Amino acid sequence: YLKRATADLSRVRRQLQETEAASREPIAIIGMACRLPGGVDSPEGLWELVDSGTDAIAGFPLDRGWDVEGMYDPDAEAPGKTYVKEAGFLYDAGEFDAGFFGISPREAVSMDPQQRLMLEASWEAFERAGLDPARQRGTATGVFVGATATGYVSVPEGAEGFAITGNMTAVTSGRISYTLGLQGPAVTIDTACSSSLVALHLACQSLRQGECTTALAGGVTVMPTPTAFTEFSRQRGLAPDGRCKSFAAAADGTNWAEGVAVLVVERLSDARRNGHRVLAVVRGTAINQDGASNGLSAPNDLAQERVIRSALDNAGLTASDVDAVEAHGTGTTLGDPIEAQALLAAYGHERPAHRPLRVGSLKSNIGHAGPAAGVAGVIKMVMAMRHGVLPRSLHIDEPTPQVDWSSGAVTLLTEPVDWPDSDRPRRAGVSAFGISGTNAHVILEQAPTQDPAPPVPAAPWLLSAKTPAALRAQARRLHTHLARHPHPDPTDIAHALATTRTPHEHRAALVTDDHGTRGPALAALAEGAPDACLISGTALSKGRTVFVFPGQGSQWTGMGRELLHTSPEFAAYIAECETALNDFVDWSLTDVLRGTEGAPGYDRVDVVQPALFAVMVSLARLWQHHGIHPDAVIGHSQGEIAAAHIAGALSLQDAARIVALRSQALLPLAGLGGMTSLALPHDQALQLIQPWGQDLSIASVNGPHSTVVSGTTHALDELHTTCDTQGVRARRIPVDYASHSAQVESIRDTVLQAATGINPQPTTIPLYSTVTGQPIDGTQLDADYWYTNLRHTVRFEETTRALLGSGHRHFIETTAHPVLALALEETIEATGSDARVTGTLRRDHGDLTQLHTALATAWTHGIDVDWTAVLGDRRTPFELPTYAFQRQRYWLE
Amino acid sequence: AERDRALLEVVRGNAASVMSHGAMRTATLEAVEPTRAFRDLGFDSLMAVELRNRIGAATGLRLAPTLVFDHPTPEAVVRHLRAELG
């Protein structure tokens, strides 16, 4: 009895532990983006800056209307002046690809560069997370941004309305959600210099509470006016030389910096489930207040110790588990000692003396980036953890004598130190304090180390951009990125390019199974030159899709053979077709396609028509498996049986029965007639055959100048001599039967018997009948319909004109070889439509290279393809360059 | 006036690409005559339509599928593109 009570308690205890752990779940950082002083436009650029120990402080910008010469004065009490001459700037703060985000040049000029910087950084951060930014439309993705109003509008005609939302601080976060159609909350936070780290704390809590699935957390600072320099230098808070000498004896103030820094975060369990690459984990986070400090602007060491201990408790860690802190470290004589004291008390006591907490600050390289500073520091530490090095902190002549450094094991990063991976995970804290008293501390941990794929031949490499120039830059940047890489798997690159990047209007695809061919084709695309394996085009904005199912002529000895081995889906559909034909046929479909000994060949009408039916049905099902769902289907003669099956009117058994028995019904007419293609319009072809009366018939009208005629051997021989005399080009079709002629009346009963017991159902995809020239109800495809199909003219051109007239712009011939493509191109030409025609396989090209060439060509024209079905669900994530933004300068003068 | 040399490179470059599918892709453009018929360079109906598609994508024009047979040489194709553009 007590075993059930004890079993219940064991379950409840486990559920209590895992629920409590979920409330403090580690948050994965899966993507980052930034633009910081000194040429930084990426996390690796930021790493290069701190690894090289570079000082990015430089002269004030000269293209912002600032009175740089007149504003200088060494006297701090001089009004409207500043004693600072250098600081951290984004000298390209006005550069923005306005067109990419559908923003007019005039709205862009009146738009605050903080909003513009956040838009490009957000796009790049999602791309670096392996997330196609457009696939985030309609998701519960939150946006948490730290930012302040910096007076960009101190306005072009017809853009004062744009200037309002373009300069609202709330819209710095809101515009991201609007532009990317994100549905989670967009909050703009202002806690002064801790804003972006508070924004990260809120994004983490939003994820822990299930409010968001993914979130953007960051900050931005642009100083379009020199106000922050004139105001804080009056308070003597700035360093005269412009350098933040974090924790140095020579520290004599802080200095301002511009920047944008964003993270894409998600719960660690969701990153592992989604197969995202975890760059680092936010294990613990906490925010608090100074409370009753020695003044509103003064820092409080007791409050900083408390926020650190709260972040450690939230992470389930102690002080000794943290190897380093990316400190707030502003370089002020007031702030620095207080932060170092709190670090010595909170971190420096329960740890080995030979393993001190190593302290540094990104502000020593670029200056204090205000709202953006906190998240900029976490990007620095994520890169430090990935490179295995703790970089140096600049300008430390001597550790500040205002701190009792002997009172705890906390040492400054006066020189770089190696960060060993062995034993335990690397961990670091990041701090951000503000003038309003709100503190933030975050505890980062190294990505867990607990995180065999065969290739797909001729895997298409897709590339696209909003303009041709941007597409050339996409190719150039990808070519450079691949050169700085020893041996990347081509299928992994193909999967990343197709599943983690947005398909824009101007498209390109590299389809090849050879080595050394893709690199040169990328360089050709980059330079605007063509290449054999380079398919290019502009996606049609709108257009419905049609699968075309021809009749005679697409067979070849070997069709389906390569695909049966290299495509288990095609083999499964052929196996279904074979089971469906077995009851009506003496031969084996698989044996016929393989050309096995004793099996019949395509010389018999009763084996080539049901084999072509099986290939076309299987190729249509293969296109649907790859995500191409047609809006309409059209068939030519016997081809209508495959079209009716794909449309849902006929079951595979009923359709196999019709094609098998109707083609067997033709056998008594062998040798009694044939068919000949005339290069003539329908009206002239009809005039030509009148002398022979009922002995000749218009069998099909496929294009404006393409008519097929059928009838008796005698009348065709006479017609051919007349053609020789009149100069009308005619080509005999290699068939021994005159389908669509009076001769099929003699087999009418046996042809009607072929469809006995069929139960025609309504269509799920409209069937545009080549018997009637219009859409037809699936329930009308009875036995008399299949006799009329065989007896009367195939109105393929007229039915094509009805498809073009109802918004159909993509025609896919689902065949072993393209036989109705020229006729389609001819009718499209005559009508003046912007429609496209692509085949599937060609004769002697029945492999995945050809299938993938067809899929890439269709994608290039605007057909949506499920590249997961084509390339596999998951591959090892391959990081790619971010979008090649085509920027222009937009600055209010 | 010199634009005809740039238009000929679009035609020649794409013709070389259509000829370069499969095993032999050791083809070059500068040496062949601009007055050489595409039929003489081994162009069938599928190659002719593929070349129309490539030129149409490069120039941004809707050309007739019979382009290569209506204008039989790269030279004749250039003056047709020159007429359609200006």
Instruction: Kindly report the nearest CA distance between residue A834 and chain B, in angstroms.
Output: 8
| Nearest-angstrom CA–CA distance, B54 and A470 | 20
Q: Is A19 exposed, middle or buried (0-12, 13-18, 19+ CB in 10 A)?
A: exposed
In CATH, what number is assigned to the domain containing residue A234? 3.40.47.10
Query: Which has the closest alpha carbon to A277: A83, A514, A400, A447?
Result: A447
Among A532, A534, A829, select the one facing B64 at the smallest CB separation: A829
| A to B CB pairs, distance under 8 Å | 33
Which residues lie closer than 8 Å to A227 by C-beta, 6 or more apart?
A150, A151
Tell me the torsion sign for CA atoms A599, A604, A606, A607: positive
Query: Which has the closest alpha carbon to A560: A595, A585, A587, A588?
Result: A595
Is A193 annotated in a binding site? The answer is: yes
Instruction: Tell me, yes or no, if B29 comes closer than 8 A to chain A by beta carbon.
Output: no
Residue of chain B minimizing CA distance to A531: B17
- Decide: A56 and A365 in contact? Cβ < 8 Å: yes
For residue A315 the two structure tokens come to 């992470």
What residue type is assigned to position A794 of the chain?
V
Concatenated DSSP letters of A630-680: -SEEEE-TTHHHHHHHHHTSS-HHHHHHHHHHHHHHTGGGTTSEEEEEESS
The alpha carbons of chain A give a radius of gyration, in whole angstroms, of: 36
Residue numbers in B near A834 (CB within 8 A): 62
Q: Where are the domains of chain B?
A: 2-85
| Nearest-angstrom CA–CA distance, A659 and A107 | 63
Contact B17 A538 (CB under 8 A): no
Instruction: Kindly report the nearest CA distance between residue B6 and chain A, in angstroms.
Output: 12
Which residues lie closer than 8 Å to A485 by C-beta, 6 or more apart?
none
The SS3 call for residue A720 is: helix
Query: Which has the closest alpha carbon to A385: A280, A282, A272?
Result: A280
Residue numbers in A near B17 (CB within 8 A): 530-532, 534
Which pairing describes strands A461-465 and A506-510: parallel, antiparallel, or unpaired? antiparallel
Residue whose pair of structure tokens reads 């018929």 in the numeric block:
B37
| Nearest-angstrom CA–CA distance, A631 and A624 | 12
Instruction: Kindly report the nearest CA distance between residue A436 and chain B, in angstroms.
Output: 59
Q: Give chain A's contact residues with B (Cβ, < 8 Å).
A: 529-532, 534, 536-538, 818, 821-822, 825-826, 829, 834, 842
Q: How far is CA B81 from the centre of its chain?
A: 10
Contact A529 B25 (CB under 8 A): no
The SS3 call for residue A331 is: coil
Contact A530 B17 (CB under 8 A): yes
What residue type is assigned to position A643 of the chain?
A
Residue of chain B minimizing CA distance to A521: B17
Residue numbers in B near A529 (CB within 8 A): 13
Residue of chain A minimizing CA distance to B23: A514
Beta bridge partners of A36: A40
Give me the half-sphere count of Cα atoms (radius 13 Å) on the Cβ side of residue A365.
30
Cα three-residue angle A293-A298-A304, rounded to 5 degrees: 70
| Nearest-angstrom CA–CA distance, A261 and A379 | 8
Residues of the domain holding A200 = 18-446
Experimental technique behind these coordinates: X-ray
Residue numbers in A near B14 (CB within 8 A): 530
What distance separates the 2 farthest-apart alpha carbons in chain B?
A: 39
Which pairing describes strands A324-326 and A427-432: parallel, antiparallel, or unpaired? parallel
Instruction: Tell me, yes or no, if B61 comes closer than 8 A to chain A by beta carbon.
Output: no
- Helices (H) and strands (E) counted in chain A, each on its own, are 30, 30
- Decide: A763 and A690 in contact? Cβ < 8 Å: no
Q: Is A886 exposed, middle or buried (0-12, 13-18, 19+ CB in 10 A)?
A: middle
Q: How far is CA A279 from the centre of its chain?
A: 19
Residue whose pair of structure tokens reads 């004030």 in the numeric block:
A60
The SS3 call for residue A517 is: coil
Query: Which has the closest alpha carbon to A394: A56, A48, A46, A40?
Result: A56
Instruction: Tell me, yes or no, if B65 comes closer than 8 A to chain A by beta carbon.
Output: yes
CATH dotted code for B2-85: 1.10.1200.10
Residue of chain B minimizing CA distance to A533: B21
Residue numbers in A near B25 (CB within 8 A): 532
**CA torsion, points A671, A673, A675, A679, in degrees to nearest 10?**
130
- Decide: A378 and A430 in contact? Cβ < 8 Å: yes
- Decide: A676 and A646 in contact? Cβ < 8 Å: no
Residue A189: φ, ψ to 5°: -105, 140
| Nearest-angstrom CA–CA distance, A254 and A272 | 41
| Nearest-angstrom CA–CA distance, A881 and A349 | 44
Residue whose pair of structure tokens reads 């081994």 in the numeric block:
B42
Length of chain B (residues): 86
Quick one: angle between helices A682-689 and A713-726, nearest 10? 110
Quick one: angle between helices A373-387 and A43-51, nearest 10? 80
Tell which residues of chain B come right before a gap with C–N over 2.5 A.
Answer: none
For residue A653 the two structure tokens come to 């058994």
Which residues lie closer than 8 Å to A348 by C-beta, 6 or more apart?
A319, A356, A357, A407, A408, A409, A410
The SS3 call for residue A773 is: coil
| Nearest-angstrom CA–CA distance, A669 and A735 | 11
For residue A27 the two structure tokens come to 């948050």
Burial A592-614 (b: 16+ CB within 10 A, else e): bbeeeeeebebebbbbbbbbbbb
| Nearest-angstrom CA–CA distance, A351 and A672 | 101
Interface test with A, best of B11, B29, B62, B63 (most A CBs within 10 A): B62
Contact B46 A532 (CB under 8 A): no
Query: Which has the closest alpha carbon to A356: A414, A396, A437?
Result: A414
For residue A285 the two structure tokens come to 């986070």
